[PDB]
Amino acid sequence: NVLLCGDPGTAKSQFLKYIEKVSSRAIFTTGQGASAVGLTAYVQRHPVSREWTLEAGALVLADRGVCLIDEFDKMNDQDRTSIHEAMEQQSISISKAGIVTSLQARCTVIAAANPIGGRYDPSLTFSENVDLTEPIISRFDILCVVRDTVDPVQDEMLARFVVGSHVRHHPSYGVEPLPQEVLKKYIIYAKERVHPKLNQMDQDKVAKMYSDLRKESMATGSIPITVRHIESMIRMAE
Amino acid sequence: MDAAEVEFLAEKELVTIIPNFSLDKIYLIGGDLGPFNPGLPVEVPLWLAINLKQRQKCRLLPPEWMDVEKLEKMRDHERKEETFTPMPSPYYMELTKLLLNHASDNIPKADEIRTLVKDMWDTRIAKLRVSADSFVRQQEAHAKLDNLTLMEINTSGTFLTQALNHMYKLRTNLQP
Amino acid sequence: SEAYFRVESGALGPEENFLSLDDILMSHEKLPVRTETAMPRLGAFFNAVPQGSKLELPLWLAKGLFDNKRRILSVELPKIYQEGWRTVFSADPNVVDLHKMGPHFYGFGSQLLHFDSPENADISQSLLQTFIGRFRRIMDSSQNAYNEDTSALVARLDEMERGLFQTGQKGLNDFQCWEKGQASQITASNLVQN
Amino acid sequence: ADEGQARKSQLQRRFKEFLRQYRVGTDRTGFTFKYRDELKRHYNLGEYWIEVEMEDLASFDEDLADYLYKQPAEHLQLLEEAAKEVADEVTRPRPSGEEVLQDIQVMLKSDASPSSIRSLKSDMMSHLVKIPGIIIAASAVRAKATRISIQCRSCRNTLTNIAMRPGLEGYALPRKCNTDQAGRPKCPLDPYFIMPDKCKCVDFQTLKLQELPDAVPHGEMPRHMQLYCDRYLCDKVVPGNRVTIMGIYSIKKFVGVGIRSSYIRVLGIQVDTGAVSPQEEEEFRRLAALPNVYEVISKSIAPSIFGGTDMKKAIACLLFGGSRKRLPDGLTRRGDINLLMLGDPGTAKSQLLKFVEKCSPIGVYTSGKGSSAAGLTASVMRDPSSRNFIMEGGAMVLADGGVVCIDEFDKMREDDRVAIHEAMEQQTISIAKAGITTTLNSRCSVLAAANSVFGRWDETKGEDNIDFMPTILSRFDMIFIVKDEHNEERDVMLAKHVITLHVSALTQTQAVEGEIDLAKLKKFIAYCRVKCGPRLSAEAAEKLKNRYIIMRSGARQHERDSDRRSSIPITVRQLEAIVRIAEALSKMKLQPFATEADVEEALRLFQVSTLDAA
Amino acid sequence: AGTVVLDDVELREAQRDYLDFLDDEEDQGIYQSKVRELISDNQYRLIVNVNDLRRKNEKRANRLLNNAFEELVAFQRALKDFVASIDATYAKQYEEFYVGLEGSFGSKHVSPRTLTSCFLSCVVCVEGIVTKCSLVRPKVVRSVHYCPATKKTIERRYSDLTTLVAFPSSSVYPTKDEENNPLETEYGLSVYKDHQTITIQEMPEKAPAGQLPRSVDVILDDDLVDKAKPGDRVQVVGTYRCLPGKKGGYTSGTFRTVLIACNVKQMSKDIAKIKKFSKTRSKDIFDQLAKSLAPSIHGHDYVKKAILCLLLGGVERDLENGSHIRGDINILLIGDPSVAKSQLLRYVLCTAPRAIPTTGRGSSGVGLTAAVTTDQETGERRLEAGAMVLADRGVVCIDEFDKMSDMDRTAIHEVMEQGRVTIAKAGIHARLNARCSVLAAANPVYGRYDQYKTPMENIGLQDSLLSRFDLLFIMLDQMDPEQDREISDHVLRMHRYRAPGEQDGDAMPLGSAVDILATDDPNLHGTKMVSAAFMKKYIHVAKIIKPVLTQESATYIAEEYSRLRSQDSMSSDTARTSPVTARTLETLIRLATAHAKARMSKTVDLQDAEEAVELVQYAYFKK
Numbered sequence A: 001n002v003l004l005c006g007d008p009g010t011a012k013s014q015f016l017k018y019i020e021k022v023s024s025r026a027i028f029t030t031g032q033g034a035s036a037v038g039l040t041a042y043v044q045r046h047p048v049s050r051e052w053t054l055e056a057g058a059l060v061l062a063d064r065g066v067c068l069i070d071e072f073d074k075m076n077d078q079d080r081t082s083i084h085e086a087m088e089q090q091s092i093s094i095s096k097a098g099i100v101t102s103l104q105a106r107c108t109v110i111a112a113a114n115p116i117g118g119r120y121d122p123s124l125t126f127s128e129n130v131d132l133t134e135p136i137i138s139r140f141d142i143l144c145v146v147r148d149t150v151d152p153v154q155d156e157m158l159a160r161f162v163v164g165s166h167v168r169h170h171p172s173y174g175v176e177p178l179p180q181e182v183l184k185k186y187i188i189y190a191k192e193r194v195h196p197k198l199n200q201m202d203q204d205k206v207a208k209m210y211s212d213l214r215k216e217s218m219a220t221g222s223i224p225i226t227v228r229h230i231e232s233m234i235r236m237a238e
Numbered sequence B: 001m002d003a004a005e006v007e008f009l010a011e012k013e014l015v016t017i018i019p020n021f022s023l024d025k026i027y028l029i030g031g032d033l034g035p036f037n038p039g040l041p042v043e044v045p046l047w048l049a050i051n052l053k054q055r056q057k058c059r060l061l062p063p064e065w066m067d068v069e070k071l072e073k074m075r076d077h078e079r080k081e082e083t084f085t086p087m088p089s090p091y092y093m094e095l096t097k098l099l100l101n102h103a104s105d106n107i108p109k110a111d112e113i114r115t116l117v118k119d120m121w122d123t124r125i126a127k128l129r130v131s132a133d134s135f136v137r138q139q140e141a142h143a144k145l146d147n148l149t150l151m152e153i154n155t156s157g158t159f160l161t162q163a164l165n166h167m168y169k170l171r172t173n174l175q176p
Numbered sequence C: 001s002e003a004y005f006r007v008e009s010g011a012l013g014p015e016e017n018f019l020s021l022d023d024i025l026m027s028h029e030k031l032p033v034r035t036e037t038a039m040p041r042l043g044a045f046f047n048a049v050p051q052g053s054k055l056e057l058p059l060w061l062a063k064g065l066f067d068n069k070r071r072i073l074s075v076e077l078p079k080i081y082q083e084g085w086r087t088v089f090s091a092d093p094n095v096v097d098l099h100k101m102g103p104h105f106y107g108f109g110s111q112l113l114h115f116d117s118p119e120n121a122d123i124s125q126s127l128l129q130t131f132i133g134r135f136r137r138i139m140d141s142s143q144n145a146y147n148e149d150t151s152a153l154v155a156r157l158d159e160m161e162r163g164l165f166q167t168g169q170k171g172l173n174d175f176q177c178w179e180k181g182q183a184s185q186i187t188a189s190n191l192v193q194n
Numbered sequence D: 001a002d003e004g005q006a007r008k009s010q011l012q013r014r015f016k017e018f019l020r021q022y023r024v025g026t027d028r029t030g031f032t033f034k035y036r037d038e039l040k041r042h043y044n045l046g047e048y049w050i051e052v053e054m055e056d057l058a059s060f061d062e063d064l065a066d067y068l069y070k071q072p073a074e075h076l077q078l079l080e081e082a083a084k085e086v087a088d089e090v091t092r093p094r095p096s097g098e099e100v101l102q103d104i105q106v107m108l109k110s111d112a113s114p115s116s117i118r119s120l121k122s123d124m125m126s127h128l129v130k131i132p133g134i135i136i137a138a139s140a141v142r143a144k145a146t147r148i149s150i151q152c153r154s155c156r157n158t159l160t161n162i163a164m165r166p167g168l169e170g171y172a173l174p175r176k177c178n179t180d181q182a183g184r185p186k187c188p189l190d191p192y193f194i195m196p197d198k199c200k201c202v203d204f205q206t207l208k209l210q211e212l213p214d215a216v217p218h219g220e221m222p223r224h225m226q227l228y229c230d231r232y233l234c235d236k237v238v239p240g241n242r243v244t245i246m247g248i249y250s251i252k253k254f255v256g257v258g259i260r261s262s263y264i265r266v267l268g269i270q271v272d273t274g275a276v277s278p279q280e281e282e283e284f285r286r287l288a289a290l291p292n293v294y295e296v297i298s299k300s301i302a303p304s305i306f307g308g309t310d311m312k313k314a315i316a317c318l319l320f321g322g323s324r325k326r327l328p329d330g331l332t333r334r335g336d337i338n339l340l341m342l343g344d345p346g347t348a349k350s351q352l353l354k355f356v357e358k359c360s361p362i363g364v365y366t367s368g369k370g371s372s373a374a375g376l377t378a379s380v381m382r383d384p385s386s387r388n389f390i391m392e393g394g395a396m397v398l399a400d401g402g403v404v405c406i407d408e409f410d411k412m413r414e415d416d417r418v419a420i421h422e423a424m425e426q427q428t429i430s431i432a433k434a435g436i437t438t439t440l441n442s443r444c445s446v447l448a449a450a451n452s453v454f455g456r457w458d459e460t461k462g463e464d465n466i467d468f469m470p471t472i473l474s475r476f477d478m479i480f481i482v483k484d485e486h487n488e489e490r491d492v493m494l495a496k497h498v499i500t501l502h503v504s505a506l507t508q509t510q511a512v513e514g515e516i517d518l519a520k521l522k523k524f525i526a527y528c529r530v531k532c533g534p535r536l537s538a539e540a541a542e543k544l545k546n547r548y549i550i551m552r553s554g555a556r557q558h559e560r561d562s563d564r565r566s567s568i569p570i571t572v573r574q575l576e577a578i579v580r581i582a583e584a585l586s587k588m589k590l591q592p593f594a595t596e597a598d599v600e601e602a603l604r605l606f607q608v609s610t611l612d613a614a
Numbered sequence E: 001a002g003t004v005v006l007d008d009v010e011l012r013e014a015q016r017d018y019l020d021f022l023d024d025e026e027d028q029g030i031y032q033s034k035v036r037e038l039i040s041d042n043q044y045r046l047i048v049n050v051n052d053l054r055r056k057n058e059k060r061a062n063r064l065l066n067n068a069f070e071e072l073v074a075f076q077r078a079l080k081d082f083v084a085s086i087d088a089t090y091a092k093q094y095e096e097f098y099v100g101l102e103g104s105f106g107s108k109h110v111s112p113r114t115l116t117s118c119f120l121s122c123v124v125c126v127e128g129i130v131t132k133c134s135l136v137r138p139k140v141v142r143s144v145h146y147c148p149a150t151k152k153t154i155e156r157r158y159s160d161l162t163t164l165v166a167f168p169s170s171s172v173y174p175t176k177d178e179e180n181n182p183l184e185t186e187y188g189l190s191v192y193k194d195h196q197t198i199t200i201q202e203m204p205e206k207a208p209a210g211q212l213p214r215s216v217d218v219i220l221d222d223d224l225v226d227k228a229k230p231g232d233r234v235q236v237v238g239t240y241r242c243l244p245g246k247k248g249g250y251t252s253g254t255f256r257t258v259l260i261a262c263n264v265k266q267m268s269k270d271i272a273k274i275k276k277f278s279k280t281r282s283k284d285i286f287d288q289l290a291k292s293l294a295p296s297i298h299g300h301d302y303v304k305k306a307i308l309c310l311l312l313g314g315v316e317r318d319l320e321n322g323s324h325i326r327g328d329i330n331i332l333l334i335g336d337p338s339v340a341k342s343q344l345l346r347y348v349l350c351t352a353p354r355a356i357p358t359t360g361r362g363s364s365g366v367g368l369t370a371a372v373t374t375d376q377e378t379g380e381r382r383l384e385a386g387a388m389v390l391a392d393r394g395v396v397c398i399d400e401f402d403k404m405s406d407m408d409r410t411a412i413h414e415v416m417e418q419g420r421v422t423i424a425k426a427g428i429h430a431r432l433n434a435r436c437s438v439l440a441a442a443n444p445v446y447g448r449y450d451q452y453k454t455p456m457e458n459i460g461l462q463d464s465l466l467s468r469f470d471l472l473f474i475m476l477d478q479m480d481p482e483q484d485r486e487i488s489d490h491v492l493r494m495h496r497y498r499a500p501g502e503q504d505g506d507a508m509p510l511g512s513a514v515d516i517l518a519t520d521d522p523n524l525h526g527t528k529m530v531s532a533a534f535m536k537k538y539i540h541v542a543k544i545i546k547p548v549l550t551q552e553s554a555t556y557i558a559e560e561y562s563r564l565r566s567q568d569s570m571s572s573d574t575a576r577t578s579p580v581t582a583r584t585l586e587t588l589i590r591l592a593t594a595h596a597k598a599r600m601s602k603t604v605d606l607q608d609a610e611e612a613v614e615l616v617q618y619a620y621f622k623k
């Protein structure tokens, strides 16, 4: 799970739409446009026979795919708390109107958010300017901060890249990328025909890292580290 | 009395073997046996026959009653009669188990023999169940069980006798 | 052969066995009585216990105090041996729960007969007919429940009937082990657990 | 033609010889006629059914097994008739009152690997199939006619003992009067009617089999399959049971044109897992007898979780439960233990809930966010088949006799949270809605997981960390406030444990020393629950009384010193909670009485909850 | 449909046996006497005891229970012969004389769960609770038609699958003579019988673990057509039958099963010397009854006294001007968690007659009052009574009363104020009787009672609703160590108790049909606390005493009412739970009447008035 927090006009939404375009089984949703019920699962009278029936929400429909949540901080707390079970336990348990069952929601959540006031503050830590709480912050394996600080040489290079992009895409780092068709084929082959297996990972290194990362997190208060960061290490290696 | 002890008494029954060894007459306390001549029949107790078969020293012959037609006739007679019919041996079930488990190679149609003896056993156990139920229901003080075998009695007799002891005391508790 | 066997119950006979744990436990069960004479100092247990007072006390104590002319006390039957419950037993003996109503139903009922109640004949016939009614189901379940959970079969049986049930189970298991050839092996005794 | 009857006769004879001749064992040990013996014992017990193994039948005669697989409906009735014959010749003679021979239900089981519900495709119609699933619904048991007789209204011409085909298929009454001449009137259009007194009927039941949760394709809802059960398969399962069904895939035979509704006629049920074999039984006696059974159980609770030993011990007490009681005046006292885990994230609360739901003999997991008052306790709704209001059980009803694992317990609405007060304390659900007025049973433990009001406990805040009411909090026997402690050696050991845990996933799942497998501990909990109800000993009760009074005085003085009410109250329900915990500890050991040691351990566990209060 | 042929030889043998049983003259004459009373009371159903039939003829009893229909028609024909022998004039008044059955039926005692298809055609005794009744509708059994053209009368008699007859019968209503003339029905000369369907449901406490209660449909005819109403716990003896149906040339083998009842028994409320001795021997029998009321709950003496007053009830007054005063007493308990409010409510549910359980979140207004449902027999919409309607002349126990919605409490306003509920639904606008006492239990807002807030804001309910309750008790978990010691001693003693028929290690059994006779088989201080079984009968006899108010007690009540008004004046706005009003005076009259009922005095004395004033003082003036 990934959280992109940061300033306006820093291509967070463009990243989310790219992941939507490239990935199979992508669900895109935004802020107030989502609900707890709509995200997870919903119960309705069946349209013709009128018995209560359970129905798939976004997280269930993305069960082996990606759920993309733009404007993540703009959601309601009641809507945002619905995704905890799907984020960690990878299930959605519903007990409503005689239905008592758990659905599979094994998706990857990629969220985009703004800090408080719409501008990240280096005077403060992430926990001090995000407005999210520890249970949801800890559920994101990768936690990115994107800033729009002034830097003239980088601004010049970025401007040249952007204007060149507008030239290249008219209707008519160094390393070179793959074509996107080839990348899609590569992705699905890598996901379905290949399965990594961990033999060893030099446990002392990661254990000591986690121990003093916990110490510094307790010192500064910047981010809770819990136990999930260890398992995030294993997941990222795989 | 245990089923193993009933088997111990069944083991005293005489069966015919064909030795592959030569041995003069042996004067056992329970009666002399032999001489043992290779290739000829000789009649010996079942424990000795089974031991010699296990030690590969003889070929066991089926008893005269271990024949499929004879056993079918006995089974049908048992199924038709209401009382226990006379059995071909007083330890026929034990004989069947011992001989067929240790000498099925020697005894042809052993599957048919085992199934027919099982049929006779089932019929006679059903008759014994009927006898016990009738005894308790009609409050008998005596029953006649002439053709039952020891294993057949011993299967149910401890339970039945205990029940009848309790029944007797219940029907005589007003005696003083 | 030389296994342990407890002293057998004598509760169905004219008197119970002195050394029988089953008879001791059976005679501990309480019996309703009325005091026909006052008992000094006994109000500490239930000052005197007054004359004509109703009590429920153990069967052993009632048998000790009772006499045929009722000087110390007079005895009432428990309700399960009175005419109301006798009729329920007469309806169908197989559906009643003699574990609740006992667990020593027959033994306790047999020992009630020594109080010279006018309905001793009815009690005796009731006990005998209850046993006759329940015999077939005890026999069938004991002799045909093999290598399974017998608790459902044993639940509603009184201690005498449960003893008979275990006897039938022993016979069944003995024959089945013989048939499967497991009776041949020499085994460490049940004390081998420690 | 009658050559078909000749084929039927020889096939029935071959089934009869299978049931007469099949044996298991070896000549070195001994032989037992498996199906003869089972027929005899079941008939004498009054059971009138047997279960045949497809592999045994195939070993005896593979053609019969192939015929049963391809054409189960045709050949199963021959097998059942042969079973009736063998039952007769195995049980004859019978006592009085048992002279009339009974029909035998032959059930089927196999060692073959099962198919999925989504494997059932049109190529397999009328074939014998084996599939797994979960029972999610079960109808009332009702009567299906197996034999009828029909009489003509004009001439009283009677057809006797008409064989009714099994399953959801019906029967067509003859269009015109049979075997007599076309007189005057020739026929009223339905000449026949079913005679009321001559019908022979058997029990039948309808169930819904849901696809297993791990069999569902990604993004799809689980599929449903209707099941027809018959005779002794009725009430053999309940909703919530995991089953492997053996049955005939078939169409009902009385959206689209040529559409036919399908179902499985169940021929055998294997509950995946009301009985313990004597070997399991005596092993459970041994396990209760050994002196450190409490520690062994606690180490068996969630073995993949590092630490949390007191929490695991309290969970063991919750799994075993106290003893339910009814007092002389008719009032009931709760036996189940309610436990709340409350605090920091990433502390394995959800993993403990997921373990307990799988380890408890009866267990359901639900999220607090995803639940409602009706869906938790019980719901009222109208049935499209008949316009009347019916009840449908919620989580509490489905978990009656076990545990409800309510994850995300702080997330549920307050109006939904007040629904479970009666079901938590009184263990009943009183409904008075739409004219139906009743009181259902909900005898189940609540194991709840929740976070702080501020995510982490944030120790300066104190009582402001809790938004739960004193009413709901007093209904929890133990309230484990769980705080993620940052200690360096603890973190190193925990990280090495987690890394080894992830590494060891490929190690073929080998057995382990000093703990109980989950499948065994589940059965052991069930055995102890059904067998043992302890009580307090007198001296133990005195100890508990005095300690309770001391704790009450301490709680009062703490609240007075604070000049504010604590969120966790110390009440008479907490006294009874200590009593229940002591009884659960004794029930682990199958002891009829709880000792001072059990009371001391119960007080030790409860004083963690009292630490959480003060 | 419905006609079946029987073997005449066995029919005559059975009829001979049953007539021998009924001709009881040489013996005690029990059934001679019972048939005499059947004639004398203008009855035509005899209730026979199968215990007596087993004593006289055991095999005939067994065949009766296992072959119900043929044996029952044989028995009814024997009964008609015997009643003709006693009184031949009376025997011709009725077409048929019926026999119902009582006693012990052995294994045929069942519940709706265990009542399987194996019991078809057997006599079964089903114990359960009534959940539905249909409307009583007539059923034609024998119709006479007059042919005006031919000037002759034909008479036809009918049957259906429900009504197996053992005589030739039709199922078509005629409209034409054999000469094709029209026929005119003679309704007065025709015979019709009442017919009703009810549903008996399994007792909820006896259901297995994960299961909802099961149901069986029961058909009641003749005198039995209104012998049970919804909410009654009943035992129905009858014949279990299936109804083979057909639908247009085809039949699904699924047949619905019904119990055709032959006897219906209530299981509630069912000599005077013990009660007379008690009331004369005891001093303040009210105190002994109140403290004996709920033994497993320590303390709460005044609340127990108030609940005893609720159980005994006041007296209902109707005045010459049509104004009305209720007799029912309403009690509200507001209190902290774990102060036994729910257990007191559960005690009243277990011991009072017609005590209906209810909870705030489990109920709705419709379920509280009445619902529209469709009669499955007919299809027409009609009313189905809710909880407070079922609780008429009884109690409704509302736990979690603060958790209830105001829209639901709107119904409770009308029920408490006027003893009725008015409805306008289905085809019917009607005024249903709901004359029930209310025993409500609630928590204060914020869960625990707050000492630093007024009682009228600790109590979350509005004063308009609070005016309805006669008494309002505040129950606080005072943490006094003395009370803690004695309470914990009592609680641990209760938790150490075990029942007599139960072994030391036994876990609590789940229920089953352990009642195996239609009447109780085993059948005043405890084994000097009063016994519960005696106290039920005592309260039953005391409820009907109807004592009159006396002048000196009236003067005392007037003096103390005015004094309580002055105390209300002097009380601060934090020192009262409720204001004092004319309804406080009415409460005093009701409580004094209940105390008089407890004494069985037939006159309200100063003794009663004193306790009434003390109880009202205790309830009203607290903080």
Ligand SMILES: Nc1ncnc2c1ncn2[C@@H]1O[C@H](COP(=O)(O)OP(=O)(O)NP(=O)(O)O)[C@@H](O)[C@H]1O
Residues within 6 Å of the ligand: A007, A008, A009, A010, A011, A012, A013, A014, A015, A112, A113, A114, A158, A162
């Ligand atoms: N580094 C960049 N390279 C290229 N385009 C960029 C870059 N940063 C921003 N943009 C452009 O800026 C525009 C806005 O992108 P967008 O993704 O909507 O910003 P954002 O991260 O979503 N800010 P917000 O929506 O307020 O949270 C797009 O047209 C992007 O292409």
Ligand SMILES: Nc1ncnc2c1ncn2[C@@H]1O[C@H](COP(=O)(O)OP(=O)(O)NP(=O)(O)O)[C@@H](O)[C@H]1O
Residues within 6 Å of the ligand: A084, A088, A135, A227, A228, A231, D304, D305, D306, D307, D343, D344, D345, D346, D347, D348, D349, D350, D351, D352, D449, D450, D451, D494, D498
């Ligand atoms: N002590 C532990 N041992 C092993 N795994 C652990 C431990 N603590 C946490 N984890 C892991 O951390 C992850 C989160 O566990 P989880 O059960 O959700 O804890 P939680 O307290 O319920 N989190 P939350 O729902 O935010 O409160 C899982 O992958 C666990 O395996």
Ligand SMILES: Nc1ncnc2c1ncn2[C@@H]1O[C@H](COP(=O)(O)OP(=O)(O)NP(=O)(O)O)[C@@H](O)[C@H]1O
Residues within 6 Å of the ligand: D333, D334, D425, D471, D572, D573, D576, E296, E297, E298, E299, E335, E336, E337, E338, E339, E340, E341, E342, E343, E344, E441, E442, E443, E487, E490, E491
């Ligand atoms: N004074 C008491 N004596 C005996 N048992 C008591 C007493 N007070 C409480 N209990 C016990 O405490 C438990 C809870 O009682 P309960 O009936 O729920 O009180 P309550 O106030 O209605 N609970 P609540 O619904 O949260 O207000 C029961 O097992 C009672 O027996």
Ligand SMILES: [Mg+2]
Residues within 6 Å of the ligand: A012, A013, A070, A071, A112
């Ligand atoms: Mg954006």
Ligand SMILES: [Mg+2]
Residues within 6 Å of the ligand: D349, D350, D407, D408, D449
């Ligand atoms: Mg969690």
Ligand SMILES: [Mg+2]
Residues within 6 Å of the ligand: E341, E342, E399, E400, E441
């Ligand atoms: Mg309550």
Ligand SMILES: [Zn+2]
Residues within 6 Å of the ligand: D152, D153, D154, D155, D156, D157, D177, D178, D191
């Ligand atoms: Zn015809």
